[PDB]
Ligand binder design. Structure first.
Ligand SMILES: Cn1c(=O)c2c(c3cc(Nc4ccnc(Cl)c4C#N)ccc31)N[C@@H](C1CC1)C(F)(F)CO2
Ligand SMILES: Cn1c(=O)c2c(c3cc(Nc4ccnc(Cl)c4C#N)ccc31)N[C@@H](C1CC1)C(F)(F)CO2
Ligand SMILES: [Cl-]
Ligand SMILES: [Cl-]
Lengths: 130, 130
């Protein structure tokens, strides 16, 4: 449940994961979602704070004085919707559903979105299959 | 960095804590904060999604069709501002700064805010000092 942290302060082991679980439940129920990400013919509702916390691209967009107030964000039409969906799920769950059939699209999408450790992980899995 | 989850899916160990760290950085810079919590003469800016994810009281308030749109929320004037501050910091960090001089106020505030495991932890620490 809790432990003594290195800073001599009480820390709750599952707190961060339980907060993320609740943020994903709010997303699933469309509660307090404040942006729709458009990827070709597909739309994905989300919370800007979670997107900024998980992506260098979204962090840049939503800290821009003009774009921070947009309710619709259109991604590059070359982005694969399934690749984006897999990464949005990862943002809200810490689970990345990589498969042989989606890894190239997930990697290209993570490069565009500036999610470096995901890109590095994709490169390592690709290197193992060559 | 990552591991094979029980659901045979790749999971990133530090993802949830790193997201929470970024949400606290946005709070510290007042980025995308969408509510001010008023506690007697003190004001605390925050993100409604994080408050709802961490409190039964805030979850009820921000799911109410009328209150979900309020930009200012006034707490009961009997709530101690320091106790609220300690709990808001806990929400964004997983670290609870309990001390002999603040534990009663933190416990009463956590009861009001419906943060059960925090209340239980406070009760256990109080029981040890009697
Ligand atoms: C480059 N980059 C990544 O490669 C990356 C990111 C990531 C996040 C920001 N956002 C921030 C940076 C710094 N400060 C502030 Cl307030 C914010 C905010 N808000 C920026 C660049 C990023 N986030 C992680 C999650 C934390 C775990 C991710 F795994 F989802 C993908 O990897
Ligand atoms: C009663 N109660 C607590 O006692 C409690 C809570 C807590 C949260 C909600 N919020 C939700 C519930 C269910 N579903 C959805 Cl979408 C939401 C949302 N959003 C409700 C009741 C709660 N949150 C945890 C953090 C998760 C770790 C806390 F540690 F900060 C304090 O303990
Ligand atoms: Cl302990
Ligand atoms: Cl592994």
């Amino acid at each position: 449940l809790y432990f003594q942290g290195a800073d001599s302060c009480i820390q709750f082991t599952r707190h961060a994961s339980d907060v993320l679980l609740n943020l994903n439940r709010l997303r699933s129920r469309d509660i307090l979602t404040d942006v729709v990400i458009v990827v070709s013919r597909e739309q994905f509702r989300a919370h800007k704070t979670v997107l900024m916390a998980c992506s260098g691209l979204f962090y840049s967009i939503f800290t821009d004085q003009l774009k921070c107030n947009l309710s619709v964000i259109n991604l590059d039409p070359e982005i694969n919707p399934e690749g984006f969906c897999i990464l949005l799920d990862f943002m809200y769950t810490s689970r990345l559903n990589l498969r042989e059939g989606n890894i190239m699209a997930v990697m290209a999408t993570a490069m565009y979105l500036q999610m470096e450790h995901v890109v590095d992980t994709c490169r390592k899995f690709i290197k193992a299959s060559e």
